[model samples]
Target: LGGYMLGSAMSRPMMHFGNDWEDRYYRENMNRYPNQVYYRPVDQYNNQNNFVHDCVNITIKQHTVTTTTKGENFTETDIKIMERVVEQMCTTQYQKESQAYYDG
Candidate 1:
């Protein structure tokens, strides 16, 4: 009921420290809230280009090879060769180009 200072038996009525050993030692020693997340504000409604060519590209080149056989043979090699060449030329259009724009 009072403040007594008698040797090691000294006592105060309601003496209290803000933190205990857990908050002071344990929390300060290591990461207290390690799994906490903090997100940064980002730009909203920003405009961007397609990052691809906006213009059409064209290709104009070709070669023809003609061969005639006098023998009465049943061979159709020219048609197959032309089909393969067409497929290869068509493949050229599929190639894509990527471009990036950054602020200076």
Candidate 2:
């Protein structure tokens, strides 16, 4: 079916190491294409450790998506607000704090 084909194309190993969380999510959640909630495994965090900044980054990206897709533009003030949002989440609290394990 088209759905099967789409999934086959969609979930192919997009990287050399491969997907670390795809199977379990498929098994536990939607168990099919259109993943009831197409969540990203990395959604839990930002460039920092605990997503303390990720939520902010995602919001900004979403803004860009909406703006660009709609052929919209931000005024200087709006741009400043966006920049401030990034500055607000600036923290040492971003990535995982655990020491490196032997695994990749």
Candidate 3:
């Protein structure tokens, strides 16, 4: 059995700018469980010029999966497939959010 805990970290460029991907690395890896989840808080304050005040975070979670050694085993290959599916699911979400934010 193998398990991994995956997470992301984001940070805003300036006081009222947007978020960017700084870096992403493994948080935890275990051989006993199949999955885990983690949550982190993001805080932003308009300290530079005090023009705009806003603070928010993008919440994410990793749903655990059962692992097996035989045909039922879930390995990196399985993760790739799952990742692609998740990307497809998020595409629409991203588009909708972008449109809502900029279309007005």
Which candidate number would show the highest lDDT if scored against the true structure?
A: 2
lDDT, candidate 2, at 1:
11
Q: Report how far residue 65 has shifted in candidate 3, in Å.
A: 6.7
Residue 64 of candidate 3: its Cα lDDT? 26
Q: Please give, for residues 1-104, the per-residue lDDT of candidate 3 as tens digits.
A: 12221232222111211222211111122222222222121123213112111111111123322234332544564444333333332333334334554665
The lDDT for every candidate, in the order shown, is: 0.21, 0.33, 0.27
> By TM-score, who's the top model here?
3
lDDT of 3 at 10: 21
What lDDT score is found at residue 59 in candidate 3?
Answer: 15
Better of 1 and 2 by lDDT: 2
- Indicate the worst ten consecutive residues by lDDT in candidate 3: 51-60
TM-score of 2: 0.29
Report the Cα lDDT for candidate 2. 0.33
TM-scores of the models, in the given order?
0.20, 0.29, 0.30
